[PDB]
Amino acid sequence: KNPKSDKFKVKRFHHIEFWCGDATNVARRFSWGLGMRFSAKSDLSTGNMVHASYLLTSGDLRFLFTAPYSPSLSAGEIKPTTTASIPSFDHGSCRSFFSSHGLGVRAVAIEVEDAESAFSISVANGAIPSSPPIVLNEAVTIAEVKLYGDVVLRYVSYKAEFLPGFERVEDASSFPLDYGIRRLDHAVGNVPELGPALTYVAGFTGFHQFAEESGLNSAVLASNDEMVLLPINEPVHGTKRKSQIQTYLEHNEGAGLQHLALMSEDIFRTLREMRKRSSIGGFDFMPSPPPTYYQNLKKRVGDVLSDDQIKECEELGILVDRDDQGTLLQIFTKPLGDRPTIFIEIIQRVGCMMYQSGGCGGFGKGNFSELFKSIEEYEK
Amino acid sequence: KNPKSDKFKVKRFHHIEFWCGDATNVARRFSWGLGMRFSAKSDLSTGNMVHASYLLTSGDLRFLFTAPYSPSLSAGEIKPTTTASIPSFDHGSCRSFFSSHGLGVRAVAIEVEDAESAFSISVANGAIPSSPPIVLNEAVTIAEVKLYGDVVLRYVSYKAEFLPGFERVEDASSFPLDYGIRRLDHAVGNVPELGPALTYVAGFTGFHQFAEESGLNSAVLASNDEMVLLPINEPVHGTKRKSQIQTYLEHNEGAGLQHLALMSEDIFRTLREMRKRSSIGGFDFMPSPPPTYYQNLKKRVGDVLSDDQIKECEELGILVDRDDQGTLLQIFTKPLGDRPTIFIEIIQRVGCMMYQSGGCGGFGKGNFSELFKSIEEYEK
Ligand SMILES: CS(=O)(=O)c1ccc(C(=O)[C@H]2C(=O)[C@@H]3CC[C@@H](C3)[C@@H]2O)c(Cl)c1
Ligand SMILES: CS(=O)(=O)c1ccc(C(=O)[C@H]2C(=O)[C@@H]3CC[C@@H](C3)[C@@H]2O)c(Cl)c1
Numbered sequence: 015k016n017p018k019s020d021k022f023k024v025k026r027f028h029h030i031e032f033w034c035g036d037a038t039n040v041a042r043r044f045s046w047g048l049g050m051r052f053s054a055k056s057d058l059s060t061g062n063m064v065h066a067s068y069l070l071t072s073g074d075l076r077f078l079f080t081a082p083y084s085p086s087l088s089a090g091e092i093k094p095t096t097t098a099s100i101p102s103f104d105h106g107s108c109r110s111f112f113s114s115h116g117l118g119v120r121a122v123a124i125e126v127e128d129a130e131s132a133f134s135i136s137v138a139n140g141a142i143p144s145s146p147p148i149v150l151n152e153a154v155t156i157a158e159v160k161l162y163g164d165v166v167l168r169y170v171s172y173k174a175e176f177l178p179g180f181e182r183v184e185d186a187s188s189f190p191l192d193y194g195i196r197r198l199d200h201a202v203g204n205v206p207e208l209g210p211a212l213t214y215v216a217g218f219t220g221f222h223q224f225a226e227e228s229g230l231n232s233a234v235l236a237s238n239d240e241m242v243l244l245p246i247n248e249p250v251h252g253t254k255r256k257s258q259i260q261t262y263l264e265h266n267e268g269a270g271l272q273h274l275a276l277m278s279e280d281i282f283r284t285l286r287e288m289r290k291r292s293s294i295g296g297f298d299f300m301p302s303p304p305p306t307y308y309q310n311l312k313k314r315v316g317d318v319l320s321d322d323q324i325k326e327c328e329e330l331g332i333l334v335d336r337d338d339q340g341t342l343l344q345i346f347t348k349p350l351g352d353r354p355t356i357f358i359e360i361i362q363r364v365g366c367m368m369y370q371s372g373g374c375g376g377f378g379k380g381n382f383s384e385l386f387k388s389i390e391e392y393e394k
Numbered sequence: 395k396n397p398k399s400d401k402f403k404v405k406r407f408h409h410i411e412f413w414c415g416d417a418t419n420v421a422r423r424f425s426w427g428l429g430m431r432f433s434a435k436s437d438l439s440t441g442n443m444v445h446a447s448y449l450l451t452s453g454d455l456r457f458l459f460t461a462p463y464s465p466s467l468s469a470g471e472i473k474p475t476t477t478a479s480i481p482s483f484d485h486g487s488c489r490s491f492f493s494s495h496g497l498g499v500r501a502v503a504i505e506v507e508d509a510e511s512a513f514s515i516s517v518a519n520g521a522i523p524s525s526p527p528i529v530l531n532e533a534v535t536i537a538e539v540k541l542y543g544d545v546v547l548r549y550v551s552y553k554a555e556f557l558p559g560f561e562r563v564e565d566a567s568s569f570p571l572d573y574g575i576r577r578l579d580h581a582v583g584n585v586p587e588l589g590p591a592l593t594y595v596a597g598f599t600g601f602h603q604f605a606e607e608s609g610l611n612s613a614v615l616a617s618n619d620e621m622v623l624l625p626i627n628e629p630v631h632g633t634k635r636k637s638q639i640q641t642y643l644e645h646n647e648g649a650g651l652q653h654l655a656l657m658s659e660d661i662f663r664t665l666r667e668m669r670k671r672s673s674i675g676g677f678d679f680m681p682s683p684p685p686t687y688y689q690n691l692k693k694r695v696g697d698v699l700s701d702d703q704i705k706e707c708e709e710l711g712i713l714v715d716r717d718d719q720g721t722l723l724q725i726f727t728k729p730l731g732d733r734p735t736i737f738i739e740i741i742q743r744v745g746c747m748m749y750q751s752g753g754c755g756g757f758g759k760g761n762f763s764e765l766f767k768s769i770e771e772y773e774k
């Protein structure tokens with residue numbers, strides 16, 4: 015069931031913003047590891063004396079990396095005279111966020127019809143305000159409310175190129191890398207208590223619940239067309255193996271964004287390219303499932319994937335799950351930075367062709383059992 | 395003249411330590427950009443609950459990247475029970491350093507005969523103590539004194555593999571990159587006042603002055619065999635173009651390390667490999683000199699480099715200088731991170747063959763005039 019209860023018009027995920035100590039080094043690492051090109055900048059060279067912000071893109075996926083300069087460079091500014099291009103930025107908030115949580119996601123941004131209306135309706139329905147609607151160059155409106163922990167949900171709306179004050183990047187610094195990633199599929203938060211987090215977020219958005227030991231309980235919130243997807247996890251205590259959700263909360267100093275799932279139009283090519291680069295500056299992947307997992311795929315998805323395609327999954331360590339509507343291929347990176355907190359998922363979905371419906375095939379919850387069974391039966 | 399006045403036995407540069415917000419991302423970027431391999435680690439996986447430290451090597455060059463974890467992970471520890479592998483590390487100091495200066499060098503480390511003797515003699519001769527001698531696993535002694543700003547000179551001495559508590563890296567995570575870099579040639583500091591900085595450092599080391607508008611004044615301190623080389627710069631005010639030393643001091647919030655010069659055994663190969671990677675996660679280089687600079691090289695160094703070798707310098711943007719003893723080839727990167735502060739120099743020296751004497755060919759001061767002349771005569 016989908017009551018289509020969104021309290022304001024939501025379009026698609028727009029961008030993800032990482033708060034960094036040094037934006038240059040994180041952005042360069044991510045560009046090479048994920049195949050994203052440098053597409054826009056706001057920094058000293060563009061007149062921004064407050065923060066350095068670099069935008070990477072791959073298809074519709076937008077990753078923004080931001081770090082503060084010395085406050086001394088902008089000590090004479092006030093908000094009405096700021097040279098910041100993101101008016102919600104604050105030196106103290108950014109430094110506090112990074113000292114507390116390490117490298118991670120500050121903003122999950124969605125494009126909406128009217129960011130001021132979305133902010134007003136959200137706050138009227140219980141959202142904790144974080145940054146009020148600000149109109150940039152009479153062209154783009156941006157506003158922010160608290161999502162969970164120190165993560166904000168950022169609303170962006172456009173009258174009619176990322177944000178005013180950003181400049182497109184010099185051709186020579188813009189190498190056209192592309193490993194096949196095309197958009198953000200979902201963004202997942204870890205919280206101490208799932209119930210209160212769901213009630214809060216669904217309360218102010220009108221997002222509905224998307225239709226679905228482990229060490230976790232989870233639920234997924236979704237917009238009207240189910241293209242904005244926000245799963246949330248809580249830990250389950252007292253399990254044999256300690257909950258990875260609880261480990262996250264300890265190392266992150268509380269709730270925050272756990273993973274970003276990036277849709278690829280060719281997951282085989284994406285994983286070939288990313289794995290070639292794992293040990294030369296890119297991203298590492300979690301240990302691959304044993305061969306028994308891939309033998310068991312024939313009975314599970316032999317009507318969807320050929321043997322050669324199953325063998326390709328095995329060569330790349332790709333996992334496969336299926337619900338009643340479609341099939342998904344997925345794989346997980348090791349943590350993106352020093353702490354065992356945020357990681358990336360690469361996903362591609364098969365089925366639900368109408369365009370493809372959001373969330374086609376689910377989120378891979380069936381792979382908790384299948385991985386487990388595989389490992390025990392591989393002990394053999 | 396070389397009075398050989400070192401107050402303790404100094405061997406060679408040992409390592410450079412960067413203090414980072416996220417050590418993983420900086421280390422991965424530097425590994426790919428410079429061709430350095432991952433060789434050692436001290437982090438959660440090795441039992442270190444305090445800091446994450448990753449060692450890259452190329453030949454004898456050792457770059458260490460360190461960032462703090464959440465203090466909560468080590469809140470029950472005291473110094474006598476620490477899980478830190480570098481006992482001088484402090485969460486507050488590291489966070490303060492990074493918030494103040496951004497990504498940069500915390501420690502210039504030299505290997506000495508006896509780190510406790512070096513510390514004691516240094517402090518008896520005016521060095522400001524930073525971390526007292528600590529013996530690690532009865533095998534390695536480490537001590538630190540203030541050099542300039544928040545940069546320390548670190549003494550390391552070995553009884554007889556980087557440091558105890560570090561583990562060698564998994565073969566699969568250790569890709570054998572190598573672009574030809576072999577050792578640290580010199581490390582350069584920027585200070586507000588050159589005179590007092592020289593008197594302080596030469597006072598406690600016994601290092602001697604190495605034998606030698608612009609916007610700077612400089613002088614070089616050197617150990618007995620002139621293999622440890624520490625140039626220091628101060629700004630010159632009131633010049634037409636504002637001093638780049640003063641820009642550094644403003645953006646860095648004071649004195650600190652300006653550049654690291656890395657010797658290559660094949661500067662042509664190093665620059666081919668680094669330039670191939672500039673726009674795919676590596677390092678950018680400063681704008682190349684105009685063709686008039688390379689025409690003028692024939693009269694300056696035509697007895698040292700062939701025409702083809704001069705053309706190779708031109709293809710790669712390499713600069714050339716010469717003194718009375720030898721010739722040097724050099725080139726400079728753009729800043730390594732967000733702020734216009736620290737950068738890298740790649741160098742290779744020709745001549746002074748006895749082994750090669752330290753500092754053979756100088757430091758390129760003659761290139762301030764030659765670049766200037768080149769640009770004016772290229773206006774032509
Ligand atoms: C094969 S598996 O390694 O056990 C495995 C399988 C699927 C995932 C996900 O992507 C998750 C989500 O997206 C939603 C949030 C909680 C649920 C749903 C999942 O855990 C992960 Cl993290 C690990
Ligand atoms: C051709 S140039 O771009 O004008 C140019 C040429 C040489 C250098 C150096 O390496 C320096 C040093 O190593 C020592 C410290 C101050 C002196 C000596 C130099 O400035 C630099 Cl930074 C830029």
Ligand SMILES: [Co+2]
Pocket residue numbers: 200202273275359377
């Ligand atoms: Co997922």
Ligand SMILES: [Co+2]
Pocket residue numbers: 580582653655739757
């Ligand atoms: Co130099």
